């Protein structure tokens, strides 16, 4: 329900669509109009995933093992048209439901932060992950030419899809945007570990000692590496790294196939064929 200091903040208004029709709370959650739409999109998507598991790929390979349940996209011979329900149209319906649910979630966040009077950084950051998913299942299939290029919905089968797509270019480590995205991911993990460690160390000092001040935080990292970035700038940098990783991963996957159809090492030939050497 409510935290002991929450009742001051449950005010009316700030909705995008609906007004007073859906302006209420359900337990701890705020629903609104987009809450209703997103919840029922998610419910239908879940029920269709369960039915697709019930039907199975055949009558012999059907199983309720959670690692082995997979719902697959259509064939490449259907192009961008609509496939029969049992032959890959269920995947398309579930994809539409998932997109609807994600957009509803983002809009509900926008409503919540309008109500609380805070900035809009959080839905803005969520839009990057939504865009990466959309590149995975919408932009790349259209550029390639068929819905069959999307990945299957299964816990272990989409790993098989990733592996085979990676080996279609004979060596995926030599993709340059892939290297940039991996560098950003590793750097983000390092920065998060350091931020957590420093805050906990300052807040929980040695025994029989008082809480440390803001000067200690800067002095520590100036004495380790000779530079300190600050309290606000560490959060700036964390957001920047986490979003750059996703942006460059989307770039790396959208150029594989649509814009390059050979092995990835060969792409570096422009460097090796310069007249300098």
């Amino acid at each position: 329900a409510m935290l002991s200091f929450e009742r001051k903040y449950r005010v009316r208004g700030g909705t995008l669509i609906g007004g007073d029709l859906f302006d209420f709370w359900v337990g701890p959650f705020y629903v609104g109009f987009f809450g209703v739409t997103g919840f029922f999109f998610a419910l239908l998507g879940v029920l269709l995933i369960v039915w697709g598991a019930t039907i199975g790929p055949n009558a012999e390979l059907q199983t309720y093992n959670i690692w082995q349940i997979s719902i697959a996209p259509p064939d490449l011979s259907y192009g961008l048209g609509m496939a029969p329900l049992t032959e890959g149209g269920l995947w398309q319906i579930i994809t539409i439901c998932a997109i609807g649910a994600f957009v509803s979630w983002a809009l509900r966040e926008v409503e919540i932060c309008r109500k609380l009077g805070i900035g809009f950084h959080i839905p803005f950051a969520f839009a990057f992950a939504i865009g990466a998913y959309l590149v995975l299942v919408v932009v790349r299939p259209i550029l390639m030419g068929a819905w069959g290029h999307g990945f299957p919905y299964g816990i272990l089968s989409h790993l098989d899809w990733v592996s085979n797509v990676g080996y279609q270019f004979l060596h995926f480590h030599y993709n340059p945007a892939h290297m940039l995205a991996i560098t950003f991911f590793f750097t983000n993990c390092l920065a998060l570990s350091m931020h957590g460690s420093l805050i906990l160390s300052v807040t929980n000092p040695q025994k029989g000692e008082e809480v440390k001040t803001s000067e200690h935080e800067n002095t520590f990292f100036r004495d380790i590496v000779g530079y300190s970035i600050g309290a606000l700038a560490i959060h700036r940098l964390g957001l920047f790294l986490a979003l750059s990783a996703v942006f460059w991963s989307a770039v790396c996957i959208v150029i594989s196939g649509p814009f390059w159809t050979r092995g990835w090492p060969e792409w570096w030939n422009w460097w090796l064929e310069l007249p300098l050497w």
């Binding site: 009742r7 903040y9 449950r10 005010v11 009316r12 208004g13």
Partner: peptide, 15 residues
């Protein structure tokens, strides 16, 4: 929801 009784700016409730 609740309604911010009085003048909303000088109410101390909500945002």
């Amino acid at each position: 929801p609740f309604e911010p009784n009085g003048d909303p700016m000088l109410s101390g409730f909500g945002p």
